[PDB]
């Protein structure tokens, strides 16, 4: 018997940030999650996430990255949980052979971002522990870094709840009923109604958006990361080893310096198993490539960070065909907002996306330029049932 102003379905990276933005404004909000965020069944665990500003996926993401960075610094001031460490982010690849490195460089120039350009042995000399061929070049962004993602979600949740937001946990939304003047969700624990709906179900958007009459190609991928015993005199955040995202002939890899001796963390970005979020095997090591694809990179490029595997994690990316996000109103329902398809690179923007989703839910518009995330764009291949 409790109506809400806004209901957020999926209180993860995007939904919890939206919940915080709504609650801060006195908007009566209900967030419903299938688990209890932060958790290890979605796309936000594994402890850390890179935030970059010079953006290799496209210079058009820069304003949102800069606003998100500002919001993360604000969050750091509002909570006792650790939010951000300014490790800097190193991007490298073979000279003239990486579109990712080239666009990162162009984005930095176009937006006057502070970066260092170096190549070959200059890279190996600046950061003991990295061994790249002499024909590699790099761009280092000193002022970007690493986010503690589970801490971010935990902090937004605590702040939102303190302002009155309600979070209904361990409750899966199974269906939606949308009318011109209201929205309704159905769950085994009861049905709830509101004036507006934000849908941010992560990998499950690939299975449940059909309940909103949407047909959009979305593919969930199983993406693992491993933490390795490393030479702390080289790979520790305390000696300024950077976060990194790099392109080599067989793909893109990313990693993090060892924090408090946890070991260097590495992931392989361009390969993952196609999976379903309800049947994915979340145990690290069940496929031999989980660990072998990581050591193939380490033994060649960061040889002193290739010791015993200390910890592994299994997480999911949800890709669109063009690998750009979907942030927009439902084409048939202005009272429904969709946040989907973050394609393995959305966490850094979650603070800014929370702001955008709040604006879309409350006003049907946003001050942010989100045209490239349109649900009606040709490359997405969206349609109705
Ligand atoms: C997995 C991964 C992702 C990743 C990364 C490394 C790995 C291994 N590294 C990144 C990085 O360094 N920098 C960055 O910017 N992004 C990086 N990513 C991607 C990023 O983590 C994802 O893009 C982001 O987390 C996506 O957020 P989203 O909010 O879409 O997904 P979520 O956090 O999983 O939250 C979804 C929530 O919805 C709930 N849910 C699902 N179904 C239901 C139903 N039916 N009812 C209610 N709730 C539902 C989930 O339980 C979850 O909490
Ligand atoms: O394989 C993919 O990456 C995919 C399929 C549909 C959307 O993305
Ligand atoms: O910055 C990103 O988007 C990232 C780093 C590692 C994986 O994704
Ligand atoms: Cl994703």
Contact 290, 227 (CB under 8 A): no
Number of the ligand 3 atom closest to the C-alpha atom of 254: 6
Please give the Cα distance from 106 to 301 (Å, whole number). Answer: 25
Question: Would the annotation count 6 as a binding residue?
Answer: yes
Please give the Cα distance from 311 to 330 (Å, whole number). Answer: 40
State the ligand closest to the CA atom of 144: 3
Q: Examine residue 38 and say whether the peptide bond preceding it is cis (omega within 30 degrees of 0).
A: yes
Query: Active site includes 295?
Result: no
CA-wise closest residue to 189 among 32, 361, 375: 32
382 lines ligand 1 (CB under 6 A): no
190 lines ligand 2 (CB under 6 A): no
269 lines ligand 1 (CB under 6 A): no
271 lines ligand 2 (CB under 6 A): no
Question: Would the annotation count 33 as a binding residue?
Answer: yes
Centre a 10 Å sphere on the Cβ of residue 47 and count the other Cβ atoms it contains. Answer: 20
Ligand 3, atom 6: closest residue by C-alpha: 254
Q: DSSP 3-state assignment of 21?
A: helix
**Sheet strand arrangement including 48-51:** 48-51, 145-148, 84-85
Query: Active site includes 348?
Result: yes
Contact 198, 211 (CB under 8 A): no
Please give the Cα distance from 289 to 280 (Å, whole number). Answer: 16
Say which DSSP state 98 is in.
Answer: -
Please give the Cα distance from 329 to 326 (Å, whole number). Answer: 10
Question: Would the annotation count 223 as a binding residue?
Answer: no
Say which DSSP state 114 is in.
Answer: -
Q: Cα 315 from chain centroid? A: 11
Centre a 10 Å sphere on the Cβ of residue 5 and count the other Cβ atoms it contains. Answer: 16
Element (H, E) at 326: strand 326-330
Q: With respect to CATH, is domain 1-59+149-212+326-385 assigned 3.50.50.60?
A: yes
What residue spans of the chain are helical by DSSP H?
13-24, 62-78, 99-110, 121-126, 149-162, 205-208, 232-235, 289-301, 350-363
Query: Active site includes 366?
Result: no
Question: Would the annotation count 29 as a binding residue?
Answer: yes
CA-wise closest residue to 310 among 252, 227, 203: 227
Helix, strand and coil percent figures for the chain, each rounded to 5: 30, 30, 40
CA 173 to each of CA 31, 33, 208: distance values in angstroms, whole numbers, following the listed order: 11, 8, 9
Query: Active site includes 211?
Result: no
Distance 347 CA to ligand 1 centre (A): 7
Task: Tell me how far apart the 2 most distant CA atoms of the chain are, in Å.
Answer: 67
Say which DSSP state 242 is in.
Answer: P
DSSP symbols for 26-74: T--EEEE-SS-SS-SSSSS-SSEEEE-SS-TT-GGGHHHHHHHHHHHHH
Number of the ligand 1 atom closest to the C-alpha atom of 43: 34
CA-wise closest residue to 382 among 344, 345, 331, 342: 331
CA-wise closest residue to 31 among 148, 201, 180: 201
Contact 50, 245 (CB under 8 A): yes
For 367, list phi and psi in degrees, rounded to 5: -80, -15
CA-wise closest residue to 319 among 294, 346, 337, 293: 346
Task: Out of 62, 64, 254, 347, give the residue to mutate to test ligand 3, the one with the largest number of ligand atoms within 8 Å of its CB.
Answer: 254
Contact 377, 216 (CB under 8 A): no
100: Cα within 13 Å, side-chain hemisphere: 19
Say which DSSP state 201 is in.
Answer: -
Ligand 2, atom 1: closest residue by C-alpha: 219
User: Which CATH class for the 60-145+213-321 domain?
Assistant: alpha beta
DSSP symbols for 126-165: HSTT----TTEEEEEETT-EEEEHHHHHHHHHHHHHHTT-
30: Cα within 13 Å, side-chain hemisphere: 21
- Which residues face 252 on adjacent strands? 247
State the ligand closest to the CA atom of 275: 2
319 lines ligand 2 (CB under 6 A): yes
Domain with CATH 3.50.50.60 in the chain: 1-59+149-212+326-385
- Which residues face 311 on adjacent strands? 227
Say which DSSP state 15 is in.
Answer: H
**Residues whose beta carbons lie less than 5 angstroms from ion ligand 4:** 43, 317-318, 342, 344
Number of the ligand 1 atom closest to the C-alpha atom of 15: 29
Query: Active site includes 53?
Result: no
What residue spans of 260-318 are helical by DSSP H?
289-301
Q: Select which of 104, 222, 315, 330 is catalytic.
A: 315
Ligand 2, atom 4: closest residue by C-alpha: 219
Please give the Cα distance from 25 to 15 (Å, whole number). Answer: 16
Burial status of residue 179 (CB atoms within 10 A of its CB: 0-12, 13-18, 19 or more): exposed
Contact 257, 270 (CB under 8 A): no
Q: Cα 94 from chain centroid? A: 26
Please give the Cα distance from 38 to 150 (Å, whole number). Answer: 5
CA angle 321, 185, 161 (to 5 degrees): 95
Number of the ligand 3 atom closest to the C-alpha atom of 243: 5
For 103, list phi and psi in degrees, rounded to 5: -70, -30
Contact 146, 85 (CB under 8 A): yes
Query: Active site includes 109?
Result: no
Ligand 3, atom 1: closest residue by C-alpha: 50
219 lines ligand 2 (CB under 6 A): yes
List Cβ neighbours of 367 (8 Å cut-off, separation of 6 or more): 359
Domain with CATH 3.30.9.10 in the chain: 60-145+213-321
Name the experiment that determined this structure: X-ray
Query: Active site includes 269?
Result: yes
Number of the ligand 1 atom closest to the C-alpha atom of 35: 51
Question: Would the annotation count 105 as a binding residue?
Answer: no
Helices 149-162 and 350-363: angle between axes, nearest 10 degrees: 40
CA-wise closest residue to 184 among 333, 324, 288: 333
CA 128 to each of CA 232, 234, 241, 242, 305: distance values in angstroms, whole numbers, following the listed order: 11, 6, 8, 11, 11
For 355, list phi and psi in degrees, rounded to 5: -65, -45
CA angle 229, 296, 264 (to 5 degrees): 25
Q: DSSP 3-state assignment of 70?
A: helix
Q: Residues, the chain, total?
A: 385
């Amino acid at each position: 018997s409790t109506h809400f102003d806004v209901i957020v379905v999926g209180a993860g990276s995007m939904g919890m940030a939206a919940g915080y933005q709504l609650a801060k404004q006195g908007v009566k909000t209900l967030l419903v999650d299938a688990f209890d965020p932060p958790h290890t069944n979605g796309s936000h665990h594994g402890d850390t996430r890179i935030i970059r500003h010079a953006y290799g996926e496209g210079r058009e993401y820069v304003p949102l990255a800069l606003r998100s960075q500002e919001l993360w610094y604000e969050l750091e001031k509002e909570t006792h949980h650790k939010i951000f460490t300014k490790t800097g982010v190193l991007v490298f690849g073979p000279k003239g052979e990486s579109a990712f490195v080239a666009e990162t460089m162009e984005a930095a120039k176009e937006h006057s971002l502070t970066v260092d350009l170096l190549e070959g042995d200059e890279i190996n000399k600046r950061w003991p522990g990295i061994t790249v061929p002499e024909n590699y070049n790099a761009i280092f962004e000193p002022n970007s870094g690493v986010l503690f993602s589970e801490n971010c979600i935990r902090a937004y949740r605590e702040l939102a709840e303190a302002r009155g937001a309600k979070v209904l946990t361990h409750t899966r939304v199974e269906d939606f009923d949308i009318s011109p003047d209201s929205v309704k969700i159905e769950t085994a624990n009861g049905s709830y109604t509101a004036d507006k709906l934000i849908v941010s179900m992560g990998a499950w958007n690939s299975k449940l958006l059909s309940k909103l009459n949407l047909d959009i190609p979305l593919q969930p991928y199983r993406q693992v990361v491993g933490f390795f015993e490393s030479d702390e005199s080289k790979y520790s955040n305390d000696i300024d080893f950077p976060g990194f995202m790099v392109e080599v002939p067989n793909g893109i890899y990313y990693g993090f310096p060892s924090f408090g001796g946890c070991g260097l963390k590495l992931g392989y970005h361009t390969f993952g198993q196609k999976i379903d979020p309800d049947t994915i095997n979340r145990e690290f090591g069940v496929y031999p490539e989980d660990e072998s694809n990581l050591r193939a990179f380490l033994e060649e490029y960061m040889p002193g960070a290739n010791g015993e595997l200390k910890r592994g994690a299994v997480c999911m990316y949800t890709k669109t065909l063009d690998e750009h996000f979907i942030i927009d109103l439902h084409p048939e329902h202005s009272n429904v907002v969709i946040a989907a398809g973050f394609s393995g690179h959305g966490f850094k923007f979650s603070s800014g996306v929370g702001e955008v989703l709040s604006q879309l839910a409350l006003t049907g518009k946003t001050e942010h330029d989100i045209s490239i995330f349109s649900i009606n764009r040709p490359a997405l291949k969206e349609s109705l049932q």
